[PDB]
Amino acid sequence: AQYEDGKQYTTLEKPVAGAPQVLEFFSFFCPHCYQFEEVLHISDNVKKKLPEGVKMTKYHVNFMGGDLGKDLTQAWAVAMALGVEDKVTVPLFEGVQKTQTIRSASDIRDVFINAGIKGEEYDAAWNSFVVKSLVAQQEKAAADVQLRGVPAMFVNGKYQLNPQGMDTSNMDVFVQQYADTVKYLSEK
Ligand SMILES: O=C(O)Cc1coc2cc(-c3ccccc3)ccc12
């Protein structure tokens, strides 16, 4: 067949009841994740190929970067809670991987301040129990699939994207193939 279990995707052996339809995991420490966001724009190209209004969910992970990796999962929970993901994704990736100016939780906060989130608003969110619940949710979703690498994308708790089965000689063709595979899976 054109799409085959074990080629463009693999099938979870213990599927996850009630999972987000389209669930992406990343780390701001992850070099391929930087490529996925800043160079390939995977999440945006996937969204443009799914029906209007569908739920794409994107969660950060703890297992890269030690202490700061866990701070970034909490900061990502702040970003989700305040709805400022689009304002802080680029400066966080660049601050960790390009300029290497993010070295502490305070440096992460500066990214939000510079992006126009008020200090009191950031700190209140950082310390909130709503943000604790969002951290818990990110952790649980990664645990549900025994996640040990990023970037990763899951469709309906059932299918995991397998980009290692895709020609990457042309960036645009690769992104298309990835997006079309998500569409195909979501229609399964
Ligand atoms: O898990 C793996 O190693 C496979 C994989 C995950 O994300 C990728 C991105 C590219 C890429 C291609 C062109 C430009 C920039 C990045 C290539 C391969 C992979």
Residue carrying the six token digits 């195909």: 184
Atom 1 (ligand 1) nearest CA: 164
Length of the chain: 188
Cα–Cα distance between 103 and 176 in angstroms, integer?
35
Supply the DSSP symbol for 116. Answer: T
Q: How many CB atoms lie within 10 A of CB 10?
A: 13
Q: Quick check: CB of 173 below 6 Å from ligand 1?
A: no
Domain count, the chain: 1
Q: Minimal CA–CA distance to 91: which of 83, 82, 99, 80?
A: 99
Beta strand pairing call for 56-60 and 22-26: parallel
Atom of ligand 1 nearest to the CA of 166: 18
Q: Minimal CA–CA distance to 103: which of 69, 150, 151?
A: 69
Which residues sit opposite 159 in a β-bridge?
Answer: 11, 155
Atom of ligand 1 nearest to the CA of 164: 4
Q: Minimal CA–CA distance to 26: which of 42, 46, 11, 14?
A: 42
| Structural biology method used | X-ray
Q: Quick check: CB of 128 below 6 Å from ligand 1?
A: no
Cα 65 to averaged position of ligand 1 atoms, centre (Å): 20
- Domain residues for 9? 1-188
Q: Quick check: CB of 32 below 6 Å from ligand 1?
A: yes
Beta strand pairing call for 159-161 and 152-155: antiparallel
Residue carrying the six token digits 């305070």: 106
